[PDB]
Amino acid sequence: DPAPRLAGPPVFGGPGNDAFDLAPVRSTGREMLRFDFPGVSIGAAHYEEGPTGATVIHIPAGARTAVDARGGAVGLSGGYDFNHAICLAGGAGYGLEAGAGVSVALLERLEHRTGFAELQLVSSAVIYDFSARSTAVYPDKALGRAALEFAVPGEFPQGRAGAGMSASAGKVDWDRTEITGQGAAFRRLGDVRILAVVVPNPVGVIVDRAGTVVRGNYDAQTGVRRHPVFDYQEAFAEQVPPTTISAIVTNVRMSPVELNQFAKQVHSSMHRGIQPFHTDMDGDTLFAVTTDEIDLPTTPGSSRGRLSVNATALGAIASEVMWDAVLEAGK
Amino acid sequence: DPAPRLAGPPVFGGPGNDAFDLAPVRSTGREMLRFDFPGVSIGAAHYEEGPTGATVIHIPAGARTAVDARGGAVGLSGGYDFNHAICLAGGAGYGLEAGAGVSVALLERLEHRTGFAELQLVSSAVIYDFSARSTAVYPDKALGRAALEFAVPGEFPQGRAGAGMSASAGKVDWDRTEITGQGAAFRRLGDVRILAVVVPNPVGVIVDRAGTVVRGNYDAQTGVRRHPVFDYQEAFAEQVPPTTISAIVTNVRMSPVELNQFAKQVHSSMHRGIQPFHTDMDGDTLFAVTTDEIDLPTTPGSSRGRLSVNATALGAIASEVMWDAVLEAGK
Amino acid sequence: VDPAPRLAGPPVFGGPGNDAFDLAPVRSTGREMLRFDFPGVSIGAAHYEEGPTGATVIHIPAGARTAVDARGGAVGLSGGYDFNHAICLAGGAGYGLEAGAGVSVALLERLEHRTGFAELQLVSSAVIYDFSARSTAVYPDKALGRAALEFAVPGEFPQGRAGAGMSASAGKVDWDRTEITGQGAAFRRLGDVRILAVVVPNPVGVIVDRAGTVVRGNYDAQTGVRRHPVFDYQEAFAEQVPPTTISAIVTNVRMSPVELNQFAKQVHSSMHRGIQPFHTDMDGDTLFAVTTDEIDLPTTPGSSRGRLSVNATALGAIASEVMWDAVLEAGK
Amino acid sequence: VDPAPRLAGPPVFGGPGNDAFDLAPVRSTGREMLRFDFPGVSIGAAHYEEGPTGATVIHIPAGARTAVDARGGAVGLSGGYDFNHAICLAGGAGYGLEAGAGVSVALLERLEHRTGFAELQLVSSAVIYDFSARSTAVYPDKALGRAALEFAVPGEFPQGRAGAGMSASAGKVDWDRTEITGQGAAFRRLGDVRILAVVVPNPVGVIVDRAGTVVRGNYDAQTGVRRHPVFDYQEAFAEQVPPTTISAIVTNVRMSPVELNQFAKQVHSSMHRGIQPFHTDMDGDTLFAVTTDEIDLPTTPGSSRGRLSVNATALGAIASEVMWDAVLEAGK
């Protein structure tokens, strides 16, 4: 039962990027998650003038990726099956520009080599975060460059940081929408490593493992948050008749087919912690990335069961890491 | 905390259809759900010799449909965007034959007219139910004909009936798998009607709204059911290194795009009640069907919120009907 | 000389059904037998004269990785599996998917009714709507699919009016101009590399040869010639708006699931050379790309003929020619 | 007479980048201007001589329903929205998606930085890899996309080496045989029905005319002629295995999302007539089908030319011819 963070009513007429001398800020959030995942780096930058920002996951070696662009209102660039970086940003479709800044920065680091096998590949996805503030500032090329420059191994800024600066949840009615943030979680099991990163800007609300609504759809008249379905069902009885962007990164080798099905499974699992989810109103996009370092055993047995060690098993574990990250974003 | 229904170990060498004089049985289940949904009929038939069966949803006028074949191991026939019937069956891919029986029975009722606009369209999906018994009997053409002949408005046989005869859940290890069944639920809100039908044969387990595991992955050594992720995570720590078929039927007019996104949303929502879900091991297939009788208002407001009456709202309500149906199947 | 017409005639869209007849499957021989060498692949074609309608079955008992490209707007598909023991192509619109159920249960019987996972027999089926081309409602049923599998043999394919091609037809701007096609196959061996194409063209469009000549479909009995449909369509718009093909490509070259899927799309799109228009709303065009995984491509793609000359795309280009040859055999 | 060669020359795969130059956008004029009448649609083409590389922007300020058919195996796409205010086609591989960001922010500025939903400016962008055809790493950047939008005018299209077509090339079995193409457009009006095709062919394959002659790409300087790639591929397999095109079709005819999506697939597949091979692993082929929703098809599809003659498939067949004309203009 956290204190409310109501976003408040829309403001119109606000200034855009051209109005300011915009200075990127290295986002620190409310606290830093630290973890051990060699070969992965994360950077987060924001403009205070939005407030809005971008979060970049950089895997300099490049990593095989599956994309599950499941929502009805997706803002995606690249969506490549192999990436050197994933860029998550505010600013609606304008914020895809941040990924261009990452791309060209990587081209510069590569000394402008352009062989087809050396192209630097950045996939980007965005949230609409303009209802949560009163400017039109968006993550631009310079901000994406800055988020990459700020990237370091083994750290993630929780909360209002990067793409999470103006993320919000619970959009039955804007008077009940609350600011979320971005979140991350990490587990290591044996040699296996799983990192989840999420920027929940859902139409739905964030739900914990007990089924409590913990962020979004807060009614100041009652002091209580509501699951949206209670609102929806009563709206129907009255009147008829009268986005989350996310990444899961692991080091377990998966074939393209396993990796794709892993992405679908983990993404669907997020309907536990975000409700409703995968709606027409949402642009929900999950990237499943593997650094392809650790083999699963050829056969799937253990003391825990004959079918206990396989990609589905990994997907179930990763689903829990992701739920933890969603709850960090809503905290 | 229901009593266990352990399916027990595989049996091999069992007899197939050719060995028996197979008599269809009208399935009655453990109890009958009654509801008011003109233009929809449901029939369920089984062979005791399996035990295995088929469940047919017949909409004689035909209805617009979206299919969300999300699992990794799908057994689907037709998958049409307009259907006169949906056939759900056991018998793995062999059980798609039941839908052929429905199709030809409908052709006969149409006096063998064959104009392109008069083709009778049946979409079928199947579960693998051979690990839950010791015969190779499957739902054949005759059984699909029988399920159609047995179809009546406004009734559904809950539990071990039709396609649910030998459905089972919780497949980390076969020694912990439990028999489920089929389930249905129905709500009417104003003029809006929503019927959910489900045959859960998941690799995962059935979970209630409190987060309790209520069917599947039962350990006779402990007397307790386990969420699979506890098994999976310990299997990884040890060793590295050392299907649900469903339909939602409503009467609300939705465009092809709304109906498709509605299908995705409702299907993903089932990861609340079935965990894990949408895995590589599963052939999860949802049909979203509308009889296109009731308009939504042109604008989405109500006293409950500015964005409270739309297809996403309907999807959230339908998601709850579906969860109720899953819990009926597991009861 | 322009080919003689094979007009289908005016459709009635109905007639007696299967049980009005004592239906005996006939092993289809077509007009000619293609013979080829590709062990592990058998083809069977059966028909009912009383339709006339039929089914063609490709049986690969080892099982083979498959990509499905269901590109048309009116597809009739069952299974569509990424690994198949058989592919069943049939007439009878969606009713003819039943033929594949006959193949499936016959294969289960051969496996002594074993039902373990590695033992499930996987049959993907696709259909053409062939009811415009005859005055009956007979369709390929379980018995006909069983018969087509029983008749399957390696190294033979009956060209023309045979199996699923028995009542296939082309050129559907107006039914008065529609012509019977057939089924067709072609085969090439390049060293030990093997490519087999099988096609059952029932297009809304017409069959076109490598010169751009319309050779089957859209025959106007008032002119004695076949025009490209676009001439009819453009004239129709001036007046009124004033100011399925099912196919398989089978190869022995190893391709990963990703390469195989893209190969399927490439070969399928290539068929818009020989069938025009293609991939329309009005078509249920479905191509199965199957590999028996017997021989590897070299690790690098060079040859004397270029730096990017030996790869799955190259194989796709070669297979596209085999498929155009098969289309032309169907229309011959 | 066979067309003269335009060999691209041997690629070095790198060179100076954008900020090595003081880059001024140039309004591209190409070899010739196509003129046509289609109010509500503007086209702008800009290039950097220092690449050479460029971008071509189609601006539809009302916004228009769109279907995207990203059929190739190596696609570079941003947005891919089902409703667009602009389509941006560019060189520079994935770096050139940045040009579309320039278009997007220019449109936001025109809207006075309003950010409501109905006001979000939607730009879909696609790219070709044109770095093989020049010795620099200059790409279409935000400034070049802004310039292409500023230069956009109704009723004009610069054919040839212009905009995104500036360094487009064809026929990539071996880089020694690759030839510069260009961009191309064609237009037809049938009563008030309007169809505009725009294409930037950078294929692995070659451009083929209606006779089946290879007209651009795969020019062998040792023979003085262009062969179909399949001749090279089949010879390569004998030896070594011993025993992108981005495009738009814009029409004013109303089509539902379902019809429009199938129309996109149909027209895109039709391009395997003029580009061969096509839809390969090696290609990022992406077609945008856009309707401005100005005129209805009749409710029933009949005419004097047939019972099924006036429908979205018919429109697709006509549009496929407009697109082949555009491909040939690009290769001319």
Residue numbers in the entry:
A (entry chain A), B (entry chain A): 19 to 260, 267 to 355
C (entry chain B), D (entry chain B): 18 to 260, 267 to 355
Cite, word for word, the article reporting this structure.
To extensively analyze the effect of amino acid substitution at position 122, we constructed 10 new mutants in which Asp122 of NylCp2 was replaced with other amino acids by site-directed mutagenesis. The values of Tm (melting point of the heat denaturation) and ΔH (change in enthalpy for the global unfolding of proteins) were determined by regression analysis using nonlinear least-squares fitting of the CD melting curve. The Tm values increased in the order of Asp122 (wild-type NylCp2) < Leu < Gln < Asn < Arg < Lys < Val < Gly and ranged from 52.9 °C to 75.1 °C (type 1 mutation in Fig. 2). However, the D2 symmetry was partly altered by mutations at position 122. Plotting the protein stability (Tm value) estimated from the CD analyses against the distance between the two monomer molecules revealed that the protein stability exhibited an inverse correlation with the a2/a1 ratio (index of symmetry). In other words, the ratio changed from 0.979 to 1.197 from the wild-type (Asp122) to the mutant (Arg122, Lys122, Val122, and Gly122) enzyme, although this value should be equal to one for a perfectly symmetric structure. A clearer correlation was found between thermostability and the nearest distance between the side-chain atoms on helix α2 and helix α1.
Nylon hydrolase (NylC) is one of the three enzymes responsible for the endo-type degradation of the by-products of nylon-6 manufacture (cyclic and linear oligomers of 6-aminohexanoate (Ahx) with a degree of polymerization greater than three) and various aliphatic nylons (e.g., nylon-6 and nylon-66). However, the post-translational autocleavage of the nascent polypeptide between Asn266 and Thr267 generates an active enzyme with an α subunit (27 kDa) and a β subunit (9 kDa). Based on the X-ray-crystallographic structure of NylCA, we reported that four αβ heterodimers (molecules A-D) form a doughnut-shaped quaternary structure. In addition, we proposed that the nucleophilic N-terminal residue Thr267 in the β subunit functions as a catalytic residue for either autocleavage (from precursor to active enzyme) or substrate hydrolysis.
